[PDB]
Write an enzyme that holds these catalytic residues in place. Structure first.
Site, short mmCIF file in Angstrom:
data_model
loop_
_atom_site.label_atom_id
_atom_site.label_comp_id
_atom_site.label_asym_id
_atom_site.label_seq_id
_atom_site.Cartn_x
_atom_site.Cartn_y
_atom_site.Cartn_z
N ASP A 120 0.83 -1.19 0.00
CA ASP A 120 0.00 0.00 0.00
C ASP A 120 0.88 1.26 0.00
OD1 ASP A 120 -1.95 1.89 0.30
OD2 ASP A 120 -2.39 1.39 2.41
N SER A 146 -0.79 15.55 -12.04
CA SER A 146 -1.06 15.19 -13.42
C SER A 146 -1.29 16.45 -14.24
CB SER A 146 -2.28 14.27 -13.49
OG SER A 146 -2.66 14.00 -14.82
#
EC number: 3.4.23.22
Length: 330
Positions: A35, A199
């Site tokens: 994770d 992004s």
């Protein structure tokens, strides 16, 4: 040194991935959920409340000659999905894919929430976010990666998750056979303890690319892709009959649909998520309403590039002094 381990979907939807991890002496092999959005290595154990164990493999520190109680240490964690666990702490030898760390904090669960109990396939979590998020008190503990880092040939790990298929986590080296084209690296902020990046935009299907900054975290422990409501609405608007259902908990679409791809930007590069990756199947057995793999992050408080996004790419988690993230097509 290096390590290399195969990671395998737990079910037919790629709801999560498990990777075998050797703990203790002799080795006790547990299948852990790696994770990159948390920083605790915790396991089901011989200390876990009996009624909260249902099919998981447990760590028994009394059968390990290298286990030592970390005296006075406890831990307690809650995840974004509402689940939680807590317990005490041992140190022991932990190996992943041939890479060994001695003195790793292995957090032994005394209690786990129902979601963990109900998932017989996940024996615990191995956190790979920054150690500043580790919950051990009164002495915060380092992640497996942080402990291994200095001994690694290069201070990196890579995630190469498969779509309906096994993939690979590598530590200490970049496998140049595992991706196509070049790797595009992008800046990371560690201010919130995550692999947080920005992004450069998105496209829906064969549509034009929208240049826009989307801050979010690269999170292998989250199944879906969570983005701003504007973006998510633009995606589902291209699927006839798709809608957000308050009762189900997100966007659903007719199971008869063909889903468009979704592209996200990494600098000047583009990662394409095929439409099939966005299908999470019927909302309940036999339903003709299907659950979407792109969902709104509104009310999470952070955008999350979870498995839906990451599995479309070869992803480099660069833990050098100034960390970065790299993405390549594959």
């Amino acid at each position: 040194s290096t390590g290399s381990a195969t990671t395998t979907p737990i079910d037919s939807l790629d709801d999560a991935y498990i990777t075998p991890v050797q703990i203790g002496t002799p080795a006790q092999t547990l299948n852990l959920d790696f994770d990159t959005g948390s920083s605790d290595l915790w396991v089901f154990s011989s200390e876990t409340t009996a009624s909260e164990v249902d099919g998981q493999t447990i760590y028994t520190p009394s059968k390990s000659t290298t286990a030592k109680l970390l005296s006075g240490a406890t831990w307690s964690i809650s995840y974004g999905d509402g689940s939680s666990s807590s317990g005490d702490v041992y140190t022991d030898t932990v190996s992943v894919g041939g890479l060994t760390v001695t003195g790793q904090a292995v957090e032994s669960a005394k209690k786990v929430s129902s979601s963990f109990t109900e998932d017989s396939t996940i024996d615990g979590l191995l956190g790979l976010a920054f150690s500043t998020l580790n919950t051990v008190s009164p002495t915060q503990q380092k992640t497996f990666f942080d402990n291994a880092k200095a001994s690694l040939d290069s201070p990196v790990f890579t995630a190469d998750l498969g779509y309906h298929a096994p993939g690979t986590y590598n530590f200490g080296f970049i496998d140049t056979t595992a991706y196509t084209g070049s790797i595009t690296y992008t800046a990371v902020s560690t201010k919130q303890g995550f692999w947080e990046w920005t992004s450069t935009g998105y496209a829906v299907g064969s549509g034009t690319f929208k240049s826009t900054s989307i801050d979010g975290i690269a999170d292998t422990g989250t199944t879906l892709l969570y983005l701003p409501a504007t973006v998510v609405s633009a995606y589902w608007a291209q699927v006839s009959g798709a809608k957000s259902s308050s009762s189900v908990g997100g966007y659903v679409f007719p199971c008869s649909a063909t889903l468009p791809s979704f592209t996200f930007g990494v600098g000047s590069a583009r990662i394409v998520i095929p439409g099939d990756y966005i299908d999470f199947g019927p909302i309940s057995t036999g339903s003709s309403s299907c659950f979407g793999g792109i969902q709104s992050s509104a009310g999470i408080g952070i955008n999350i590039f979870g498995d839906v996004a990451l599995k479309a790419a070869f992803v480099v988690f660069n833990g050098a002094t100034t960390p970065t993230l790299g993405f390549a097509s594959k």
